[PDB]
Amino acid sequence: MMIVIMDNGGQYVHRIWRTLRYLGVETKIIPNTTPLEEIKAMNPKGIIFSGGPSLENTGNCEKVLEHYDEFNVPILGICLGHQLIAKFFGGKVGRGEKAEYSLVEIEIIDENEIFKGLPKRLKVWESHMDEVKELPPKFKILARSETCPIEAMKHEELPIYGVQFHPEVAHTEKGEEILRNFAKLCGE
Ligand SMILES: [Cl-]
């Protein structure tokens, strides 16, 4: 399917695209400020809200959520994208303890999907410069780490997913497979 990646300015955005391309998925990176009508014309079968340095630069990602019925496809937020989803849906985001990137062990408490067929525990590449501190209503925790309770989440009714870490970075164990599982929700 056509998976649209909304670029929030993050350093790893091109790795999202290259991973999907390796998997044979049709995908395009677009500016986060792309007008909604132009996004709709791309006929997205899925949308990814990429990482980026700041919640002050999320463009039309919240607008897509506001207009979710016009898209009605799976959405994955990565880091900033996970955080902006959490804020939109009524959770809380705040500064975390460790801003520097590192490999962190997570436990998947609900395989669901993005973690389908994968080990229960994974080492993932991530920062906690910011973090989802309080789960939005109508969401479920999918994964946690020793000190971060909400490493991944999903809406309980809609196919809207968030991960704090970067599956597009190869240091992340099974990162490619997480993105493949998401792509499979979108079709093919
Ligand atoms: Cl990024």
Number of helices and strands (H, E) in the chain?
A: 5, 11
79 catalytic residue (yes or no): yes
- How far is it between the farthest Cα atoms of the chain? 43
Structure tokens at 79: 């880091």
Phi/psi of residue 128, nearest 5 degrees: -115, 40
How far apart are the CA of 162 and the centre of ligand 1, in A? 14
Q: Which residues surround ligand 1, an ion (CB under 5 A)?
A: 10, 12, 51
How far apart are the CA of 120 and the centre of ligand 1, in A? 25
Structure tokens at 120: 């229960």
How far apart are the CA of 127 and the centre of ligand 1, in A? 11
How far apart are the CA of 40 and the centre of ligand 1, in A? 24
Burial class (CB within 10 angstroms; exposed 0-12, middle 13-18, buried 19+) of 36? middle
DSSP summary character for residue 69: G
126 catalytic residue (yes or no): no
CATH of domain 1-188: 3.40.50.880
How far apart are the CA of 153 and the centre of ligand 1, in A? 18
Phi/psi of residue 124, nearest 5 degrees: -125, 150
How far apart are the CA of 86 and the centre of ligand 1, in A? 17
**Options 126, 131, 168, 173, the catalytic residue:** 168
Q: List the one residue out of 165, 118, 168, 174 whose CA is nearest residue 144.
A: 165
Amino acid letter, residue 46: G
Total residues belonging to the chain? 188
